[PDB]
Curated annotation (Swiss-Prot), chain A:
Subunit structure: Part of the 40S ribosomal subunit. Part of the small subunit (SSU) processome, composed of more than 70 proteins and the RNA chaperone small nucleolar RNA (snoRNA) U3.
Superkingdom of source: Eukaryota
Residues annotated with N6-acetyllysine modification: K22, K31
Zinc-finger ranges (C4-type): 39-62
Organism of this sequence: Oryctolagus cuniculus
Modifications the protein undergoes after translation, according to the UniProt entry: Monoubiquitinated at Lys-25 and Lys-31 by RNF25 in response to ribosome collisions (ribosome stalling): ubiquitination promotes subsequent activation of RNF14, leading to EEF1A1 ubiquitination and degradation and rescue of stalled ribosomes. Deubiquitination at Lys-31 by USP16 is required for maturation of the 40S ribosomal complex.
Cross-link (Glycyl lysine isopeptide (Lys-Gly) (interchain with G-Cter in ubiquitin)): K25, K31
Full-length numbering of the shown residues: 83 to 150 of 156
Protein name: Small ribosomal subunit protein eS31
Subcellular location: Cytoplasm; Nucleus, Nucleolus
Taxonomic lineage: Eukaryota, Metazoa, Chordata, Craniata, Vertebrata
UniProtKB/Swiss-Prot annotation, chain B:
Pfam families registered for this protein in UniProt: Ribosomal_L7Ae (PF01248)
Gene Ontology CC terms, in alphabetical order: cytosolic ribosome; cytosolic small ribosomal subunit; Golgi apparatus; nucleolus; small-subunit processome
Subcellular location: Cytoplasm; Nucleus, Nucleolus
Domain of life, per lineage: Eukaryota
Entry keyword DNA-binding: no
UniProt protein name: Small ribosomal subunit protein eS12
Alphabetically ordered keywords of this record: Acetylation, Cytoplasm, Nucleus, Ribonucleoprotein, Ribosomal protein
GO biological process, one term: positive regulation of canonical Wnt signaling pathway
Function: Part of the small subunit (SSU) processome, first precursor of the small eukaryotic ribosomal subunit. During the assembly of the SSU processome in the nucleolus, many ribosome biogenesis factors, an RNA chaperone and ribosomal proteins associate with the nascent pre-rRNA and work in concert to generate RNA folding, modifications, rearrangements and cleavage as well as targeted degradation of pre-ribosomal RNA by the RNA exosome. Subunit of the 40S ribosomal complex.
Oligomer status and interactors: Part of the small subunit (SSU) processome, composed of more than 70 proteins and the RNA chaperone small nucleolar RNA (snoRNA) U3. Subunit of the 40S ribosomal complex.
Length: 68, 117
């Protein structure tokens, strides 16, 4: 329709491209040294990573924000 | 071989012991919850080959080489639409993780004796 208020738009998300390839640092030797921290919860295994922001470290699903 | 790979992926489809994709495949690799893997080489992979050889050079990870990304996506259960002959559109997959349980078959023995060689 045509309304007086401006139209509210949904969250136009951005598309990722090979995200974990930016965190598995691989050199020419046998080293797989990571850039992102693993999960400290024993509910899951050791596959998921945490958020890497400038001041905190957030989960994917555990919602345990690590401060400084 | 090719028919053994088709048989083990059909067993994975019939017994839900399959981990497709990349993220959950690497998660199942890091979870110590994997048995077999494959790989599609000689493609447009600037970093994917070196990342996946680092990923599969960890704990006796088996590989089966294949030319294209196309016929891997037919026996895995990728695009099971328009079954009246030829498929309509099948996208490309790189690697898959198989953790079959009911492995009382001749094809597993054939591919495993091929792996221990």
């Amino acid at each position: 329709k045509s309304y007086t208020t401006p139209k509210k738009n949904k969250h136009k998300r951005k598309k990722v491209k090979l995200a974990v390839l930016k965190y598995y640092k691989v050199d020419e030797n046998g080293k797989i040294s990571r850039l992102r921290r693993e999960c400290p919860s024993d509910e899951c295994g050791a596959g998921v990573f945490m958020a890497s922001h400038f001041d905190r470290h957030y989960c994917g699903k555990c919602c345990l924000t690590y401060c400084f | 071989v090719n028919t053994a790979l088709q048989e083990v992926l059909k067993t994975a489809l019939i017994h839900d012991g399959l981990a497709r994709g990349i993220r959950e495949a690497a998660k199942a690799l890091d979870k110590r919850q994997a048995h077999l893997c494959v790989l599609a080489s000689n493609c447009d992979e600037p970093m994917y080959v070196k990342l996946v050889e680092a990923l599969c050079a960890e704990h006796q990870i088996n590989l089966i080489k294949v030319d294209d990304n196309k016929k891997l996506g037919e026996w895995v259960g990728l695009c099971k639409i328009d079954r009246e002959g030829k498929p309509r559109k099948v996208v490309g997959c790189s690697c898959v993780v198989v953790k079959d349980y009911g492995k009382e078959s001749q094809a597993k023995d054939v591919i495993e004796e091929y792996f221990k060689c």
